[PDB]
Amino acid sequence: SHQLKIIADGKALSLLAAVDVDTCYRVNSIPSATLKLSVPDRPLSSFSQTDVQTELAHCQVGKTLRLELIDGSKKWVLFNGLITRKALRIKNKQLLLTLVVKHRLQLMVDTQHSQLFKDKSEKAILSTLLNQTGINARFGKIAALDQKHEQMVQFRCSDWHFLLCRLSATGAWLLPAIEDVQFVQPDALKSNSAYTLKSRGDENKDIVVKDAYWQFDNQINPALLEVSGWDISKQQVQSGGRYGKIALGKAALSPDGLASLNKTGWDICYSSPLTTQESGYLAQGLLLNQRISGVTGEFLLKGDGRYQLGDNIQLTGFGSQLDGTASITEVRHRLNRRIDWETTVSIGLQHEYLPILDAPELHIATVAKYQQDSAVLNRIPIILPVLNRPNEFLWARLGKPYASHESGFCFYPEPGDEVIIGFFENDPRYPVILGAMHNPKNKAPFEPTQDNREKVLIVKKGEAQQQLVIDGKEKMIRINAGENQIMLQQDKDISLSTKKELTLKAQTMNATMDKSLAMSGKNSVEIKGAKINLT
Amino acid sequence: SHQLKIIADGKALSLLAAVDVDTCYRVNSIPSATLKLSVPDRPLSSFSQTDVQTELAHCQVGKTLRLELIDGSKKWVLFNGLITRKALRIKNKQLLLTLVVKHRLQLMVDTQHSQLFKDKSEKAILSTLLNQTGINARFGKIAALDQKHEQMVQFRCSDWHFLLCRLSATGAWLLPAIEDVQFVQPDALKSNSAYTLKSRGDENKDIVVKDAYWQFDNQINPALLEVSGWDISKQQVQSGGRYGKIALGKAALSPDGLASLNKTGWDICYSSPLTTQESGYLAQGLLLNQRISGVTGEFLLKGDGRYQLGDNIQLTGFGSQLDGTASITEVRHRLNRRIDWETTVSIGLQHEYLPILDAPELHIATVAKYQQDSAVLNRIPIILPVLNRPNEFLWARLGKPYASHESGFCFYPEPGDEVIIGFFENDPRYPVILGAMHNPKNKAPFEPTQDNREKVLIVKKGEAQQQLVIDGKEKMIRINAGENQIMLQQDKDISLSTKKELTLKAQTMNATMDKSLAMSGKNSVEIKGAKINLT
Amino acid sequence: SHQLKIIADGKALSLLAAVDVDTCYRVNSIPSATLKLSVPDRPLSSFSQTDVQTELAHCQVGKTLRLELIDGSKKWVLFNGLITRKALRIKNKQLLLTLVVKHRLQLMVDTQHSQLFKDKSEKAILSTLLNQTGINARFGKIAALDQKHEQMVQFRCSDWHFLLCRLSATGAWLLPAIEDVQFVQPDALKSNSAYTLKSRGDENKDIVVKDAYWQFDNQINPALLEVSGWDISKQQVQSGGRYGKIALGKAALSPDGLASLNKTGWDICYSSPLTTQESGYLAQGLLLNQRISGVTGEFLLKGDGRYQLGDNIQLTGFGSQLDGTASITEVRHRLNRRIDWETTVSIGLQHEYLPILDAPELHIATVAKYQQDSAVLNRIPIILPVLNRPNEFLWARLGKPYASHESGFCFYPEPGDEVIIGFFENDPRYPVILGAMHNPKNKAPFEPTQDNREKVLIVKKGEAQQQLVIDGKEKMIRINAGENQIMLQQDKDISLSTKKELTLKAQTMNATMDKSLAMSGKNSVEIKGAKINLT
């Protein structure tokens, strides 16, 4: 607990001693540090010389930093990360510049870009999310991250804002170490290395404890939680499971216990088509957030600092309400001259996740070319301009007027058409199409006109127009089925106009005209019957 | 003001004396308490024995608690509620465990479930909202709560999050007492019991006052407020009323006065179809929130504590700016040894409501069976899976392409069909349908195909298909009206194919074929006219 | 720095001396003041007399106030604005009433009304936004405010909530002076008046500096930013430009420098149809907010207070990391007796704008009469009831099922029809129509019925109905094209019913009936051919 050294941009510093260090690690967050450091001898008149301004070039913002506290027989490292705030404060004719050093996980909270992960497990997602930034990814045995997605969209949020929105949907911690961040399931954290905290103590081998504190919340505790999502086939709400009572911690320090104030439970019924596997992992994901705020604590220990964010400490010798074993969260350090070196290690975590993943707003999208590899649904492929890649596509269910049992109005839009997409429960994985639009490129066949004469349902490729025209002014219905054949019906008349050949195929036939009748055919008229007569 | 006793889980406590009590009641909130209590004699080595850990089992989280301060000639009760935070803190070789006791109104903020109140007054709503949890409901004479709703949806928010979102839409206070919560209109609170606060004092019968404070805000004050909602019939915006100047308090402590910085007023024009009665009660509901933050105050009194949250105290003898009468809000108590017992009673309240009621996102819904009991509209009944009950139904207006004056494209969806619902101004009482969908259960008649050959408008029950087929590849329009009768029109040809019998009923008739004509009917041909000739 | 005088409601005050003044100006905010003032001699018993309550009538809320500190040879004015909080606090038998004085820019944050600016530049918008309240508008040379809008909607937000949501979309500061607020581009603020801050000092003409502070953030810095919006014609995403590296400040106090932690940059792809000029000004608008939080500082100077919010101060003689020139932001003043008079002037600003402009929710709108002055698009004019003016109209793109290349289902709604509008990326400038509705005024031609017999596509004016009826129960398709002419097709039969005249115009014609054939025409039958025969 003596003589730390600060390596700034690969070069160890000796011009400015540190008068304060506060290193704060934490589960499911970036870890941070804080260096308050000052000059030992240089006055304010002799501060602005060439030697002191040289070292502040090493301390400039964005340079790496690693502070290593030398034990005397070991060399503890405490932090390794980038300078983010360098704030110099000068008063009472002396200066004291603060540093704020942030981990490499703070490199992800900088960016903001939308990206499409189409068919990947979350382990394949979090690999490509951390490899993209430049921090290595150590993994653990997770039962939730081996889960394949048909689509997975990060929609205009940060990379660390997408990260813990996914780590809260699977229920797995983040353990940011010094060299590599590692993921671990909270249940697998048990049976790890175990430092004992005794109320007796009175030994040199035991751990000295000061300022112990623990707190039992029951403000909001679900006793039973289920997350149920829609099933598109066999239209029902299939709940993934009523997952209550997660096994975590040990006796009288478990979040289990602390019985809920309502015995009925909890229920959320998502309307997005979630699978039974995903909503099952989501139910114990949300359950883990509410229960783990129930038991909290902190313990201000001595210096030596071999504690990390994975291990669990047990309380022994205490009262039967206070004893138990729980996983360490949020290791802190402090280095003053008032105190030598301490470690106020803690237990448990808060519930609310600072990230944001959902896009509530409407968008437009161009329908891409044909694809078939989906399951049997009417999902049509779209291209979203908000998504950056114009080559990758998204499935999207089509909303149409009168889509009945087998009797649907089916006019599937052509590739290259513009649509109006909205998202099921604001989820970027589940878009749905609300219509189609015309353009200056894809022109409507008619401008809107005052007392709009014609109302059409015209479908064509440009070589042949198969129309259904209703003229409300001239009181017509023109089935212009092809450009040649018009079946005209006035309000006062009727017609049937052909180009080549007309055909009647019935069993019997009747004609009845009271005023007159005239049949006329040039160049041949034949009338054939087994009994022909004229009356 | 001596010797309070704490009954924890029905058993009065004497092992741990209380070193602090802070009981905070408040209008339109849960009331709370805070007990800091410690052991009188037991050291840390003798803390973990069987006698002390027995009493902490009574102090465990979720147990009821009631603290009763014994006056000596009376027995005041101060609080009755559940333990919610039990936090033990140990430092300097002594421990001091804090309790946080919460009212039975905190039982409602725990839950989160969506529920459908179809046809009930709000008095019938708040009865079934408080009976469901387990707190009795005392009522007062309210002019706003006797208001019937066609629908009323709590959509995935808490019960206390739905409660004051309704108490802010009707403009009525909540008065949480010790034994039963009671509702009261703010205007009916006047002419209640009246404790006088004098600047002269100098008596034993008068009330001793310390640390008086009052504050006059005018940051945002509407001078005139109107809330106007849409009227579906006779399409206009019918405002419920320009309700300004609510009568509350008395002279120079009324929120009236403190003239607005803008004289023009305030206007919100909701697009949801609110009634004229509801938007009238909403206008003085929102007006009550802005004005009541205008005049605020607090008065730190002596011990005896006969003040409750309903009565109003008048100031007399003060300056003519400072005098007046206003309803007591937010009674507090404190019990130290530095002070004996005090009551820092207050006046007025803040404006923002911590609850949340609105669902902005899209959903899907299955259309239920036929119902008729609505007023004359095209509202079709739907079943929402996000709502828990599959038996109860919701009306929903139908969005269709080209719904004109009397000339509408009317294809009302069958019962059992899936729709795309969105909500008018995000209101769960007003859904609207944006389309209909196909399914693996309700299959589309055709898969989407590359260069999609056919475009259909087919309507059927499965025994008979009445179609309107346009084949864009083979350049046809096939009016397959029934499975037998096809009216074919090629791009180069035409046809009219029948099964049984064709009919012509005109006045005159013409046929004109320039290349050839042939009529053929087997087994009989008859031609009848008053003048028959062949040319 | 002696003897300020406070003019309250046009009348200078002398009954109550001021024991504290804190005047806080700030760029892109309202400026404020705070007056703690107390009585010099009047006791509490003699506080409530007629002379002291007279002066508090001048100090009442909403009265104007102007405090003028008299230098002795000059007369500095410091503030001019309205009383907003008057809070009297009385304790220890003495009172000390606080005033909170707010600028005339606080008059705009009061209101909340929706308004439609159809065709105006932002300079013509901010003129009519400040003239409406009653504060004059001084302008500067802005390259962004001379930008014409096809539409511009303030949708149910405050006037100051619409103001800086527009000043952040153009990237121009607000400089609130004492007499007139002035706008200025941040780049044009350079080469202004320049007060030098020296580390040497040691003169009477130089500026005395205490408590200097500066802070370099790099928490979130875009290295390159582009904002790309949709182009309706030639459907693509045309980015306005990759505007990085804004020129502001000078060397070692510029936001340029402090290199980003990610070198890749930043990208947002809006789906709303923004122009190339608007998204270009939006890219340097958002870039200005992130970079200007990078360099911050504050300098506690002496009294005399000739500094204003526009000028820039340079640091000279300091270290080469610390020197530089940057524009003054957030001038403060303090007037105690402990300190004589100070001015803790600052540099740089925070990033997040407290205002709110976007309406995510659905609405309804009545389609207005015909208008033509748009560019070539299918935008149809609507009237929004949420917008206050029923005379002004909004364009809105129409969403229709199957709007293909030139083959669109075109049923443009009549004027006076009700629609379902949603907004592209929640933007009130870009609505889009999702359907049309029936009414009690615009009645559907049929009530929805159980086992709904008929499905119609009927278009009419009331004098003549041109229908397309499919009866699913009676298994018919009735092309009631006009009220007289019905083309009936049963499931077992067919018909063709006319009123006046039928016509066949083909080249060849065939009839084929296997059971029987009968043609009948009363009062005349003619059969004409070049070769007539009967077989």
Radius of gyration of chain A: 37 Å
Identify the most extensive interface between protein chains: A-C, 129 and 122 residues
Tell me the helix content of chain A: under 10%
Give the assembly state of these chains. Answer: homotrimer
Strand content of chain A: 35-45%
Q: Structurally, how many domains make up the residues of chain A?
A: 5
Number of helices of chain A: 4
Largest sheet of chain A: 9 strands, antiparallel
Q: Which structural class should the secondary elements of chain A be placed in?
A: mainly beta
Shape of chain A: elongated
Q: Ends of chain A: how far apart?
A: 127 Å
Tally the beta strands of chain A: 40
PDB class: protein transport
Keywords: assembly, Photorhabdus asymbiotica, PVC, contractile injection system, protein transport
Assembly: trimeric
Entry title: Cryo-EM Structure of an Extracellular Contractile Injection System, PVC baseplate in extended state (reconstructed with C3 symmetry)
